[PDB]
Design a protein around this ligand. Structure first.
Ligand code: FMN
Ligand code: ADP
Ligand code: MG
Ligand code: ZN
Length: 155
């Protein structure tokens, strides 16, 4: 399809996204043989795949949730493995162990090594802003039915 996508279980990262950055990210790791988009930041959709497993929080399966997505090694922090990491906008759910699909709709920015967490946070806020606008255009492009996605303006 026109959206690059990957699927796989949400697994444990460094534990810093929510606690330290205020941007929790659902982490996926793939073998180096698996085709991925270029390291960078993307606007896209995260969907919990069809399942009978209970989901705790305000996300349910088979709905495309607006997400700001990073691909790479988190060079600001010097992490060892390449991850795909999805910050689901305006939601709060326990995704660990759930099988999810992540669709990459638009490239937003190159992956960058920032000197400080504070500088990184300022830029991530702007990535989220651009993600909202890009995803509203994508809704229109596919004439997506309201029940099939979740996308808000921020409070
Ligand atoms: C939209 C978005 C943009 C990001 N941009 C960068 C970046 O430019 N440089 C970087 O080192 N990490 C970037 N990250 C990743 C954060 O470093 C990472 O998600 C955070 O350290 C949490 O790590 P963890 O999930 O293992 O706890 C970005 C993450 C998101 C969600
Ligand atoms: N809006 C959200 N987007 C992504 N993950 C969320 C969100 N709200 C809660 N979570 C949960 O928080 C975890 C991500 O937080 P994070 O600090 O990045 O932990 P980790 O380092 O283990 O990836 C997810 O795996 C999921 O269970
Ligand atoms: Mg994370
Ligand atoms: Zn599209």
């Amino acid at each position: 399809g026109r959206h690059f996508y990957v699927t796989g279980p949400v697994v444990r990262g460094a534990g810093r996204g929510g606690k330290e950055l205020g941007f929790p990210t659902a982490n996926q790791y793939f073998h180096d043989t698996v085709a991925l988009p270029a390291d960078g930041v993307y606007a896209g959709w995260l969907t919990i795949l069809p399942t009978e497993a209970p989901v705790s929080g305000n996300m349910e399966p088979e709905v495309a949730y607006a997400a700001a997505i990073s691909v790479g090694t988190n060079p600001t922090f010097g992490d060892e493995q390449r991850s795909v990491e999805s910050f689901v906008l305006d939601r709060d759910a326990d995704l660990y162990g759930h099988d999810v699909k992540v669709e990459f709709v638009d490239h937003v920015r190159a992956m960058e090594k920032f000197d400080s967490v504070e500088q990184l946070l300022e830029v991530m806020a702007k990535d989220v802003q651009k993600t909202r606008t890009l995803l509203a255009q994508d809704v229109q492009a596919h004439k997506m039915a309201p029940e099939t996605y979740f996308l808000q303006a921020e409070s």
